[PDB]
């Protein structure tokens, strides 16, 4: 197979062969609609096992929907949703959170590496509490792993959870790349979520191997009923649910999801180790997951561009490039990029 | 294969083997996200060919989303969406139209067989026009084929189109079962849509053979831009679009969609012909598509229920039963039901 | 003074001289804004006395705002607001309820004389309860006195309250013409509201004597906090609240409001007694409040129209006219209309 | 009269005696409702004269409503409303703009003295234009005079207008204190609005002398129709409009509004001139309107507080106090404050 030249995002990758085959297997026969079938029930039982707790699960088509739905059930229209200014909900959902929540307001809390600064968060969540002329603190959202591939430690997450419980705020986790942060920390799903104070999680699978299926995992099960209506009302209740369930079931079979995440993180780590010490190349950050950033010589950026590589190079500081690897990124794919970088140095 | 005992709805069926296999074929390699890939472009070209016109296409996860999105772009918040009181948008979307349109109001216009009465429609669309204290006529929605399996004729559709153009109202078609009405009429997609005045269509495929992929087909292309944002904002813009595109492409290959619709309609027609003249059985309607209604003796309803058949029997008048067939309903499946009806008579 | 020829509605009348003078008295000095002044506190204490209970009060600019705000706090976006099809919320608020509630859906329940039929209400409020694809029963709204001048008896109101408590539904009262129904029944404010099960009331004063000031009276005080934010968010929290408070205080001084209502009802009753037995004139209904309907000979309608009288005559059945009297309608004003009717018969 | 000790805001003042008397005069007789009366027509003609142009006028109860309504007609739900982070729409309307616009997003553009920095504005309004995943630039809002009493010059306003026309963005002016900036500049209403590119103005009168009546002045008259429905739908269409019209008519009679603004600005200017050179007192800014800020010795702040003065002293930097004067602030009121400041120094 020729080397895959795309490193723009993990969203360009396909799906593990086991996922597509699960769809084939489940394409025959009849099945109750809207999640009333056995496969769906099986998947829900799997989430309970995986999270070591009775949790409520709602499979939806996209991560944007998962996020907006979660947040809409955790804030009134006159409420505030605290998040990092570089978060996906504040930048790439065309205001989906604002839509689903019926006008809630996002309040940004800056911090290095796309992580909310705990001190600032503590200050913002106590602004004008009770003042009738001001929108009110309602919930907090943190992306795990972050939009730049950094990772909140178990201590940092739990710390945010303190502030949330302290001000009666809900805590949501945008886990579009949940698995990548999970395998980097080597902790349990439970330790990185409810045991740390998370109330709702956007369990991402699409970016880590499936076709199109995300899971809303509710730890604060009292929101289940509201969530059902909100999902349906937003047009996110799939009639032939087995086709979302089949994807996730495969995803959660034989530890496929974790293996896929390990391969993605392993690929970026390989890239960082190969880029360290090359002419006109400075790796930025620790490359904790499947996303790597590095400062490159412009001429080397054009050489990579001319070489047919797909990557972003204008969204941040001058000369800062971003390479994103996926579950399907082979060691070979990475070695091709390294070689082209070397040869272009 | 044993006989399929479910006739509750076509939404219990799986997917044509060609669809799942298309997903397998397209699960490898990389592809631009959010519909920027070649397969998606191919599918769009196919819609233009099929409809004999440059049309704008937006693939979405569900029919509820397709409907709500279409209607939201055709009415202001203070506008009215005219529809039959038995329509899906007025009953089974938990108010999705109201949600997406930011509060538009559904105005029902009754009529036999789930078809809007043209005279009543003409009267309702001219109520308080221009009155500041009243919501205003904005658009009209007709389900083709209807929720009860009846079909609007080309003349009836076009007639509704006159009223719409007359009052500057948009005309939307809920084509959840588009194909079933199309093959029953034997007309062209164009003749049953834009040539008759339709501005926006919810092109249904899920119920006729795919896993989960519907298509918003815009004939009034001036709404394209607004539709992009609305789709994204509602969380309905799938990142790995090839998995929706692959389904639809297969659906629109070798006339699969039409063949599937023919088989579904053929199955119901077989059932109606077998039920005609049996004890305690009166077939209601002409069974124009893949949905059949009949009045049955209660005892025969329990015998079918005890026989393990799945069907609705309480949603309408007393003793009125509904059997729905799908693209996968075999002549054998139908003959089993007929036999059980006979034996239970 | 010449006779007042307008009988279109009570909304054409001005304000009792005591109201305007209260504004004069309170136009000097300084006062805390947004209802934090003494006059406002005084008014709130008056509502508690008048209703013989601790109630929460929120003065707002219009009856449409009072209605929408009340209902928005009693129903989720996916909820249903039951009301008569001829109700103001379903006809003349350009969808304000739909707006404030973020998309809730009005469900009409017909009945003679603009009064919800209890049997139908009982059936509608138990439709698809718990069904995820359907909007849910949330609250009920009854207009007291109704839009046609009829009145719900204490028994009828309480009966609706049973259904509401039975299905955990909130009960709102549109009291745009609260006082007119109150003095017709001769009951206490408490007996016609909370003692009968009402949770929220749109206490109308504008139509009965003030310039522009309505009062949201909450008996279910647990909604107070939410109501504050909703009122502010909707732009209905007046900064110089004393100018709404001054109007209402005057309104509730020396039983002015009741006296005003008595005069309005007395005027319509005088008109009905004078119209009974005249050529080409049939009085319809019992004229329980300040609104009278009668069937008149077309030629007599033009004679009244040519005589300069203002009234509606096309909104109902053929030849059905509506005369509405106000707190300022003198016996003289009524005698002029009667004379012109006589002379035109 | 004893000295008025309140300087918290101009919203604590009452109304010019001419306003209350206008209400008295107009409290008798009958009048068409919802702005269909002669007084209202008269007022509209006055706005056209005052602005030297045919403009559309919509009188509403509050400034928050005026703002939200204006902005809702200038941005789609997926649009951006650019404003200063210290603006009223971004801080004290409990998200009214977000509510009325159905979820539009406020994008802050910082700058000294509550004035949007033109360079930053130019950069922000061209972010992700056309990108489907991002909310889009839609309109800009500037407060004239600003929330801190500063004033945009005719050149600064027009400059913002260039950017707006350049990117097809609407330009709204929050003129809560319109008159104060107008008399400080000595320009014409037209020069400070449409001649500089303003499309919609929240014409503030309440803070400058009336009881409760603001005016939405539309220079982009093509939005009139939409505005009517939006106003009604939001519950802001007063039935007895003459009571808003009477206030504004008085306000715009014998140059009362301008005289009132001159007195307010004159009072603050007197205060600044008296505070200049006193112990432990530093005046901040040029005091261009009716709002003054100064840094005071804590002990002097308690002495003023103990003296019974009402003012804010915690909302900004340490030791920064704010005194706001109104149309009713006499030279005497100001001399009392100066004396107490002196004696407390
Ligand atoms: C990719 C991503 C999402 C989801 O995007 P969709 O295209 O809506 O599925 C959400 N959050 C983050 C941080 C992401 O990287
Ligand atoms: C099945 C159906 C739909 C779509 O329902 P989803 O479950 O949202 O895909 C829409 N309209 C009609 C008439 C239908 O029968
Ligand atoms: C007059 C009236 C209202 C209020 O109308 P506004 O013009 O918004 O104050 C509300 N309900 C009923 C039944 C009315 O008659
Ligand atoms: C006072 C003010 C308003 C209006 O407030 P309301 O209480 O809603 O009338 C709006 N903008 C600014 C800048 C203000 O100072
Ligand atoms: Zn902790
Ligand atoms: Zn025709
Ligand atoms: Zn009872
Ligand atoms: Zn310029």
Coil/strand/helix, residue D129: coil
Quote the tokens at residue D192.
């400070």
Q: Would you state the structure tokens that stand for residue B343, as one six-digit string?
A: 């034996």
Question: Is the distance from CB of B100 to CB of B68 less than 8 angstroms?
Answer: yes
Q: Is B285 left (phi over 0), alpha (psi -120 to 50) or beta?
A: left
Q: What tokens does D123 get? A: 């950069």
| CB contact set of D14 (below 8 Å; sequence gap of 6+) | C26, C27, C28, C29, C30, C31, C240, C242, D211, D328
Asked if residue B247 lies in contact with residue B211, where contact means CB atoms within 8 angstroms, the answer is: yes
Half-sphere exposure (CA, 13 Å, Cβ side) for D94? 23
**Helix, strand, coil % in chain C, rounded to nearest 5:** 40, 15, 40
- Tell me if residue C304 falls in helix, strand or coil: helix
Contacts of B29 in chain A (CB under 8 A): 4, 14
A162 C-beta neighbours (distance < 10 Å), count:
14
Say how far apart CA A241 and CA A61 lie, in whole Å.
10
The CA distance from C263 to C333, in Å, is 12
Number of H helices, E strands in chain D: 13, 10
Burial D71-95 (b: 16+ CB within 10 A, else e): bbbbbbbbbbbbbbebbbbbbbbbb
Q: What is the torsional sign of CA D215, D220, D224, D227?
A: negative
Burial class (CB in 10 A: 0-12, 13-18, 19+), A310: middle
Q: Number of C to D CB contacts under 8 A, please give it.
A: 173
Q: Residue D45 CB: number of other CB atoms within 10 A? A: 11
**C319 ligand 3 Cβ < 6 A:** no
Domain shared by D261 and D189, yes or no:
no
Token couple for A281: 């190349």
Does residue B269 have its Cβ closer than 6 Å to ligand 2? Answer: no
Q: What is the 3-state secondary structure (H, E, C) of chain A?
A: CCCCCECCCHHHECCCHHHHHHHHHCCCCECCCCCCCHHHHHHHHHHHHHCCCCCEEEEECCHHHHHHHHHHCCCCCCEEEEECCCCHHHHCCCCHHHHHCCCCEEEECCCHHHCCCHHHHHHHCCCCCCCCCCCEEEEEEEECCCCCCCCCCHHHHHHHHHHHHHCCCEEEEEECCHHHHHHHHCCCCCCCCHHHCCCEEEECCHHHCCCCCEEEEECCHHHHHHHHHHHHHCCCCCCCCHHHHHHHHHHCCCCHHHHHHHHHHHHHHHHHHHHCCCCCEEEECCCCCCEEEEEECHHHHHHHHHCCCECECCCCCCCEEEEECCCCCCHHHHHHHHHHHHHCC
Strand partners, C266: none
What separation in angstroms does the CA of B283 have from each of A9, B319, C83? 57, 12, 38
CB A89 within 8 A of CB A174: yes
Q: Are B299 and B330 in contact (CB under 8 A)?
A: no
CA–CA separation, B313 and B47 (whole Å): 38
Domain boundary pick from B255, B278, B307: B255
Which residues constitute the domain of residue C312?
5-15+256-345
Residue B186 gets the label, from left (phi > 0), alpha (psi -120 to 50) or beta, of left
3-class DSSP state of B183: helix
D317 burial via Cβ count (<10 Å: 0-12, 13-18, 19+): exposed
Helix (H) or strand (E) holding D244: helix D242-251
Whether A100 and A206 share a structural domain = yes
Residue A287: which residues within 8 A CB-CB, separation 6 or more?
A149, A268, A269, A271, A272
How far apart CA A56 and CA C20 sit, in angstroms, is 59
Q: Please provide the distance, in angstroms rounded to a whole number, between the alpha carbons at the two ends of chain B.
A: 26
The burial class, CB within 10 Å (0-12 / 13-18 / 19+), for C306 is exposed
CATH number at residue B86: 3.40.640.10
Structural element, H or E, at residue C22: helix C17-25
Q: How far is CA A274 from the centre of its chain?
A: 26
- Closest Cα in chain D, distance from residue B78 (Å): 7
- Output the domain CATH number for residue B298: 3.90.1150.10
Report how far Cα C252 is from the mean position of its chain's Cα atoms. Answer: 17
Edge-first strand listing for the sheet containing D320-324: D281-284, D291-296, D320-324
Instruction: Compute the radius of gyration of chain B from its Cα atoms.
Output: 20
Residue D232 Cα to ligand 3 middle (Å)? 12
Question: Which residues in chain C are followed by a discontinuity, with C-to-N distance exceeding 2.5 angstroms?
Answer: none
C-alpha B313: how far from chain center: 22
* Nearest residue to D206 via CA among D247, D262, D147, D151: D247
C60 phi-psi bin (left φ>0, alpha ψ -120 to 50, beta other): beta
Residues B180 and B210 in one domain: yes
Q: Are A30 and B4 in contact (CB under 8 A)?
A: yes
Contact yes or no for C106/C98 (Cβ under 8 A): yes
Which ligand places an atom closest to the C-alpha of D232? 3
What is the Cα gyration radius of chain A?
Answer: 20
As a whole number of angstroms, the distance between CA D321 and CA D275 comes to 12
Paired strand residues for D345: none
Per the document, the length of chain B is 345
Give the Cα separation of C93 and C87 in Å (integer). Answer: 10
Which ligand has its closest atom nearest to the C-alpha of D155?
A: 8
- Contacts (Cβ under 8 Å, ≥6 apart) of C212: C61, C62, C206, C244, C247, D61, D238, D239, D240, D243, D244
Alpha-carbon distance of B277 to B279, in angstroms, equals 7
Residue of A132, A136, A232 with shortest CB distance to C132: A232
Distances, alpha carbon A141 to alpha carbons A105, A137, A171, A191, in Å: 12, 12, 6, 17
3-state secondary structure A30-88: ECCCCCCCHHHHHHHHHHHHHCCCCCEEEEECCHHHHHHHHHHCCCCCCEEEEECCCCH
Residues sharing a CB contact under 8 Å with residue A236, sequence separation 6 or more, in sequence order: A60, A61, A65, A69, B61, B62, B65, B235
Tell me the sheet residues that pair with C106: C81
Which tokens in the block code for residue B244? Answer: 């929706």
CA distance A292 to A286: 8
| D10 closest CA partner among D326, D321, D262, D330 | D326
The answer to whether the beta carbons of residues A62 and B236 sit under 8 Å apart is yes
β-bridge mates for residue D283, sequence order: D294
Q: Of C198, C227, C255, which residue is a domain's last?
A: C255
Query: Per the structure block, which two tokens stand in for D334?
Result: 């100001």
Residues B61, B65, B66, B67, CA torsion sign: positive
Q: How open is the CA angle C122-C134-B182, to the nearest 5 degrees? A: 125
* N residues, chain C: 345
- CA B299, chain centre distance (Å): 33
d(CA B93, CA B106): 12
Q: What is the DSSP letter of D56?
A: E
β-pairing, B79-83 vs B136-143, is parallel
Contact C157, B114 (CB under 8 A): no
- Give the closest residue to B242 by CA, choosing from B12, B59, B50: B59
Q: Please list, in sequence order, all residues whose beta carbon lies within 8 angstroms of the beta carbon of residue B14, skipping any fewer than 6 positions away.
A: A26, A27, A28, A29, A30, A31, A240, A242, B211, B328
Longest dimension (CA), chain A: 63
What gap in Å lies between CA A289 and CA B258, rounded to an integer? 47
Q: At what angle do helices B256-275 and B178-185 cross, to 10 degrees?
A: 70
**Pairing state between β B105-108 and B79-83:** parallel
Question: What are the CA-CA distances from residue C62 to residues A70, B30, C122, D239 (Å)?
Answer: 35, 59, 31, 8
Residue B126, annotated as binding a ligand: no
**Protein residue with its CA nearest to atom 14 in ligand 3:** C176
Q: In chain C, how many domains are there?
A: 2
D112 Cβ partners below 8 Å, 6+ apart? none
Residues of chain A contacting B234 with CB distance shorter than 8 Å = 65, 96, 99, 234-235
Positive or negative, the CA dihedral C26, C29, C33, C38 is: negative
Strands across the sheet with C291-296, in order?
A: C281-284, C291-296, C320-324
CB B144 within 8 A of CB B175: yes
Nearest to D95 by CA among A135, A72, C73: A135
Atom of ligand 4 nearest to the CA of C33: 7
Q: Which long-range contacts (CB under 8 A, 24 or more apart) does C107-110 make?
A: C107/C80, C107/C81, C107/C82, C107/C83, C107/C135, C107/C137, C108/C82, C108/C83, C108/C84, C109/C82, C109/C83, C109/C84, C109/C85, C110/C84, C110/C85
User: Does C214 share its domain with C278?
Assistant: no
First to last CA, chain D: 26
> Are residue C294 and residue C202 in the same domain, yes or no?
no
- Checking chain B for breaks where C and the next N are over 2.5 Å apart, the residues before them are none
Residue of C nearest to A78 (CA): C229
Contact C78 B91 (CB under 8 A): no
Let me know whether A129 and A222 are in one domain.
Answer: yes
- When computed from its CA atoms, the radius of gyration of chain D, rounded to whole angstroms, is 20
Residue with tokens 């100064």: D294
For the CA atoms of D151, D157, D159, D163, what is the dihedral angle to 10 degrees?
Answer: 120
By the 8 A CB rule, do D134 and D78 touch? no
Residues C140 and C247 in one domain: yes
Please tell me what resolution, in angstroms, this structure has. 2.0
Rounded to whole angstroms, the Cα distance separating D269 from A297 reads 58
What's CA A257's distance to the chain center, in Å? 13
Binding residues of A for Zn(2+): 158, 162
Backbone angles phi, psi at A244, to 5 degrees: -100, -40
Contact C198, C173 (CB under 8 A): yes
CA distance D235 to D253: 28
Rounded to whole angstroms, the Cα distance separating B129 from D65 reads: 26
Q: Report d(CA D299, CA A288) in Å as an integer.
A: 54
Question: Phi-psi bin for D288: left (phi > 0), alpha (psi -120 to 50), beta?
Answer: alpha
Q: Please give the torsion angle defined by the CA atoms of residues D204, D205, D207 and D208, in that order, rounded to the nearest 10 degrees.
A: 120
Strand partners, C217: C57, C201
Q: Does C333 touch chain D (CB under 8 A)?
A: no
User: Would you tell me how many other CB atoms lie within 10 Å of the CB of residue A143?
Assistant: 29
Structure-block tokens of residue A284: 């930025």
Closest CA to D140 of D122, D164, D115, D124: D164
Strands (E), D68-169: 79-83, 105-108, 136-143
Q: Are residues A179 and A102 in the same domain?
A: yes
- Residue B50 tokens, joined: 């099929």
Which residue's CA is the nearest one to ligand 1's atom 7?
A: B239
Please tell me the distance from the alpha carbon of residue A263 to that of residue B48, in angstroms, as a whole number: 41
Angle between helices B242-251 and B256-275 (to 10 degrees): 60
Contact check, Cβ <8 Å, D229/B102 = no
Tell me whether A103 touches chain D (CB under 8 Å). yes
Q: Are residues A143 and A78 in the same domain?
A: yes
Separation between Cα atoms, residue A27 and residue A49, nearest integer Å? 26
Ligand 7 centroid to C157 CA: how many Å? Answer: 8
Q: Same domain, yes or no, for B27 and B64? A: yes
Is residue A105 packed enough to be buried (19+ CB in 10 Å), middle (13-18) or exposed (0-12)? buried
How many CB atoms lie under 10 A from the CB of residue B131? 14
Yes or no, beta carbons of C99 and B77 under 8 Å apart: yes
For residue A315, the chain D residue with the least C-alpha distance is D128
φ, ψ (nearest 5 deg) of residue C64? -65, -40
Rg for chain C, CA atoms, rounded: 20
Q: Distance of alpha carbon D172 from its chain centroid, rounded? A: 12
Q: Please state how this structure was obtained.
A: X-ray
DSSP C310: B
**Could you tell me if D165 and D272 lie in one domain?**
no
C38 by Cβ neighbours in 10 Å (0-12 / 13-18 / 19+) ranks as exposed
**A228 and A264 share a domain?**
no
**Contact at 8 Å (CB) between B239 and B33?**
yes
Domain boundary (B223, B255, B287) is at B255
Give φ, ψ of D53 to 5 degrees.
-170, 155
User: What sign for the dihedral angle of Cα A35, A37, A40, A42?
Assistant: positive
């Amino acid at each position: 197979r020729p080397p895959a030249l795309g490193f723009s995002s993990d969203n360009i990758a396909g799906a593990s062969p086991e996922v597509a085959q699960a769809l084939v297997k489940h394409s025959s026969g009849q099945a109750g609609p809207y999640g009333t079938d056995e496969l769906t029930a099986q998947v829900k039982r799997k989430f309970c096992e995986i999270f070591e707790r009775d949790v409520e699960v709602f499979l939806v088509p996209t991560g944007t929907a998962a996020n907006a739905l979660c947040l809409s059930a955790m804030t009134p229209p006159w409420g505030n949703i605290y998040c990092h200014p570089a978060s996906h909900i504040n930048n790439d959902e065309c205001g989906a959170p604002e839509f689903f929540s019926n006008g809630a307001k996002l309040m940004t809390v800056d911090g290095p590496a796309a992580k909310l600064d705990i001190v600032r968060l503590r200050e913002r969540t106590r602004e004008k509490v009770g003042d009738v002329h001001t929108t009110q603190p309602a919930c907090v959202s943190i992306t795990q792993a972050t939009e730049v591939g950094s990772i909140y430690t178990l201590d940092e997450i739990e710390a945010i959870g303190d502030v949330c419980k302290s001000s009666s705020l809900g805590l949501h986790m945008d886990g579009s790349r949940f698995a990548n942060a999970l395998v980097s920390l080597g902790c349990s799903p439970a330790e990185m979520t409810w045991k740390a104070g998370v109330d709702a999680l956007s369990f991402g699978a699409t970016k880590n191997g499936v076709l199109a299926a995300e899971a809303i995992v509710l730890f604060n099960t009292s929101l289940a009923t509201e969530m059902s209506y909100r999902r349906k009302r937003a047009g996110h209740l799939s009639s032939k649910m087995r086709f979302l369930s089949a994807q996730i079931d495969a995803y959660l079979t034989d530890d496929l999801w974790l293996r896929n995440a390990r391969k993605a993180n392993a690929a970026a780590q390989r890239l960082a180790q190969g880029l360290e010490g090359l002419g006109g190349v400075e790796v930025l950050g620790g490359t904790e997951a499947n996303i790597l950033f590095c400062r490159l010589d412009s001429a080397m950026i054009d050489a990579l561009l001319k070489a047919g590589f797909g990557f972003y190079h204008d969204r941040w500081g001058p000369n800062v490039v971003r390479f994103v690897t996926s579950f399907a990124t082979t060691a070979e794919d990475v070695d091709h990029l390294l070689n082209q970088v070397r040869l272009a140095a």
